[PDB]
From a paper:
[name] produces the catecholate siderophore acinetobactin to scavenge iron, a nutrient essential for several metabolic processes. The biosynthesis begins with [name], a standalone adenylation domain, which activates and loads 2,3-dihydroxybenzoic acid (DHB) to the phosphopantetheinyl arm of the PCP domain of BasF. Adenylation domains have two subdomains, a large N-terminal subdomain (Acore) and a smaller C-terminal subdomain (Asub), which is highly dynamic, adopting unique conformations to carry out each individual step of the adenylation reaction. Several binding pocket residues were identified within 5 Å of the ligand, including Asn242, Phe243, Ser247, Val336, Val344, and Tyr346.
The [name] mutation further expands the binding pocket, showing improved activity for both 4-fluorosalicylic acid (∼9 fold) and 4-methylsalicylic acid (∼89 fold). This mutant also had significantly higher apparent kcat/KM for 4-azidosalicylic acid (∼40 fold), a trend that was not observed for several of our other mutants. Although the [name] [name] enzyme was soaked with 4-azidosalicylic acid, weak density was observed for the azido group of this molecule. As the azido group may be flexibly positioned or has the potential to hydrolyze to an amino group, possibly promoted by the reducing agent tris(2-carboxyethyl)phosphine (TCEP), we placed 4-aminosalicylic acid in the observed density, which fit well. We docked the 4-azidosalicylic acid molecule into our [name] structure, which showed that the ligand has the potential to bind similarly as our expected pose, with the azido group pointing toward the [name] mutation. The binding pocket of V366G showed an even larger expansion, which provided further space for the azido group of 4-azidosalicylic acid, resulting in the near 40-fold improvement in activity compared to the V336A mutant. When comparing [name] structure to the other [name] structures, we also observed the nearby Tyr346 to slightly turn toward Gly336 as a result of the extra space being present. However, the conformations of the remaining binding pocket residues were maintained. The V336A mutant bound to 4-methylsalicylic acid and the [name] mutant bound to 4-aminosalicylic acid were used to compare with the binding pocket volume of the WT enzyme.
Residue numbers in the entry: 3 to 437
Write the structure that this text describes.
C-alpha cells in the first residue's frame, strides 16, 4: 500500500517546474504509448536478428505486466533486474513501469556482493536474471537468500532451465485471468538509479517519472534525435548515460531505433554499425580509444556514423580532435551524473567549445554553484567544487539521511564532488574530482 519513500522537491520548486513545462506528470510509459499511436510499425529495437516494432514492444511488455499483476505484484513492491544488452532488458523495464513495480537495474558485471547489498536494501519480491551469469550458473546465491528470509516470491530466468521460470515464457503469452494494474504516480518514484564513483557499493538514487522523463525529453532535443536516429547501445544498458542522456529512452522518445551490441568491441561494433547503418553512438573515452585504433582499417564499415557522444571520464582536447578526423563523424562532449545534472556541448557550438569543454546544463533552470573549501563562490574562471540543483536533480539518496546531510547544503544544492571551472563562453570544463 505504501509507495516507496524518497526525498521530495519543495512545492515552490515543484510548481515552477510544472509551470515551465518540465514536469508534465506522465508515466515513463508515455514513450511507448505515444510511439504506438504515431508509428506502431517503426522499428523500436534491433537485437541480433530480431526486429521489434513499437507495438511489438508494447504488446510484449504488457504480456509480462499482466502476469506480474496476476501474481499480486504491483505498487509498493520492488524488483531487482540483472539482464545483458538484449531486447528483453527493455521489455522488462517497460513491463515493470507499466505494472507499478519500482525496479533497480543492476549492471550485468555486478557480482554477488553488490546484488546482495541491493536485495538487503530494496527487499524485492521479483528477481529477473540470466542463467548464463556467473552468479546464477549454480543455485548457491538463490539458496543463500532463503536462509535470511530475503528469497523473492517470483524468480524469472533468462536462458532458463526446465525447472526455472522462463522469462521468455512469461513474455510470449499474457495471463489467463485479468487483474488491473497501473504505473506509480508521475511525481512518485519510478525506479532506482545507481550512483557512480561511490566508495562502497553504488548508492540508490530514486528517479520519479516527472524528472526522468524531463531529462530524457531535454536530452533528446539538445542531441538532435529524430525518427531516423539509429543509436548503437554498446555501453551497459542500465547506465544513465546509455538510458537517458539521451540514451535508448531518448531515442524511443524521438521515434528512432535502438541497436543492441554486447559491448564496445571495435570489430563487432563496426559490423553491427555497417549491417544496420547505425548513425549515432555513445561512448566513454576508454572505448573511443579502442575505436580509434581500429577505425582506419575499417573506415567503410563505420561511414554511416553521424554523431558520437563522449562523456564519463577525461577526454583531452588532443583526443577530441581525432573523433571527426578518424571516425568521420561529429563530436558531442558530455558530462553527467546519475544523481541528476547532465551537461552537453550544443550541436551549433564552436569547435573550440566542442573540443575543449564538456558543455553546459540541459535545463535553463539547472542551478550551478562553483565554490571553494570555505564554501564560497570562486571568481569566474577559477577551479572549484560543483554544487547543483534543478528539475531533474535528486534530493537525497534512498534511506541515507546521514550521507544526505553531508552532500546537500541548506539550500539543497547537491555537491557532486567534481572539480570544474566555467569558461568565458559559459561552458563548463570538468578538471578533477574531490572527496
Ligand atoms: N550524459 C552522461 C554522461 C556520463 C554520465 C556518467 O555518470 O558517466 C552520465 O550520468 C550522463
Ligand atoms: Ca518482429
Ligand atoms: Ca517525435
Ligand atoms: Ca560518417
Ligand atoms: Ca579523415
Ligand atoms: Ca559523482
Amino acid at each position: 500500500k505504501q509507495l516507496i519513500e524518497f526525498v521530495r522537491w519543495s512545492p515552490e520548486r515543484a510548481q515552477h517546474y510544472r509551470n515551465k513545462g518540465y514536469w508534465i506528470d506522465q508515466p515513463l510509459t508515455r514513450i511507448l504509448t505515444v510511439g504506438v499511436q504515431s508509428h506502431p510499425h517503426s522499428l523500436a529495437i534491433i537485437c541480433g536478428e530480431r526486429q521489434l516494432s513499437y507495438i511489438e514492444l508494447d504488446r510484449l511488455s504488457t504480456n509480462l505486466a499482466t502476469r506480474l499483476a496476476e501474481k499480486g505484484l504491483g505498487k509498493g513492491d520492488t524488483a531487482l533486474v540483472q539482464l545483458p544488452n538484449v531486447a528483453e532488458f527493455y521489455i522488462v523495464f517497460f513491463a515493470l513501469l507499466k505494472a507499478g513495480v519500482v525496479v533497480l537495474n543492476a549492471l550485468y558485471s555486478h557480482r554477488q556482493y553488490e546484488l546482495n547489498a541491493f536485495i538487503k536494501q530494496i527487499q524485492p519480491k521479483l528477481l529477473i536474471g540470466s542463467r548464463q551469469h556467473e552468479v546464477f550458473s549454480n543455485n548457491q546465491f538463490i539458496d543463500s537468500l532463503h536462509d535470511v528470509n530475503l528469497s523473492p516470491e517470483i524468480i524469472l530466468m533468462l536462458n532458463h532451465q526446465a525447472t526455472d521460470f522462463g522469462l521468455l515464457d512469461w513474455i510470449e503469452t499474457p495471463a489467463e485471468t485479468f487483474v488491473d494494474f497501473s504505473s506509480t504516480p508521475a511525481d512518485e518514484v519510478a525506479f532506482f538509479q545507481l550512483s557512480g564513483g561511490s566508495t562502497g557499493t553504488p548508492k540508490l538514487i530514486p528517479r520519479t517519472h516527472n524528472d526522468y522523463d524531463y531529462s530524457v525529453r531535454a536530452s533528446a532535443e539538445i542531441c538532435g534525435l529524430n525518427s531516423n536516429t539509429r543509436l548503437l547501445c554498446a555501453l551497459p544498458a542500465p547506465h544513465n548515460f546509455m538510458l537517458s542522456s539521451p540514451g535508448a529512452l531518448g531515442v524511443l522518445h524521438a521515434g528512432g531505433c535502438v541497436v543492441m551490441a554486447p559491448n564496445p568491441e571495435p570489430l563487432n561494433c563496426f559490423s553491427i554499425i555497417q549491417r544496420h547503418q547505425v548513425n549515432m553512438a555513445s561512448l566513454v573515452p576508454s572505448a573511443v580509444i579502442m575505436w580509434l585504433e581500429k577505425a582506419a582499417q575499417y573506415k567503410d564499415q563505420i561511414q554511416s556514423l553521424k554523431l558520437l557522444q563522449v562523456g564519463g571520464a577525461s577526454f583531452p582536447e588532443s583526443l577530441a580532435r581525432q573523433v571527426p578526423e578518424v571516425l568521420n563523424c561529429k563530436l558531442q562532449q558530455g558530462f553527467g551524473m546519475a544523481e541528476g545534472l547532465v551537461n552537453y556541448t550544443r550541436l551549433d557550438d564552436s569547435d573550440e567549445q566542442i573540443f575543449t569543454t564538456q558543455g553546459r546544463p540541459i535545463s535553463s533552470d539547472d542551478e550551478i554553484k562553483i565554490v571553494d573549501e570555505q564554501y564560497r563562490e570562486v571568481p569566474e574562471g577559477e577551479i572549484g567544487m560543483l554544487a547543483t540543483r534543478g528539475p531533474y536533480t535528486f534530493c537525497g539518496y534512498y534511506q541515507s539521511p546521514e550521507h544526505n546531510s553531508q552532500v546537500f547544503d541548506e539550500d539543497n544544492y547537491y555537491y557532486s564532488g567534481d572539480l570544474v571551472q566555467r569558461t568565458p563562453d559559459g561552458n563548463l570544463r570538468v578538471v578533477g574530482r574531490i572527496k
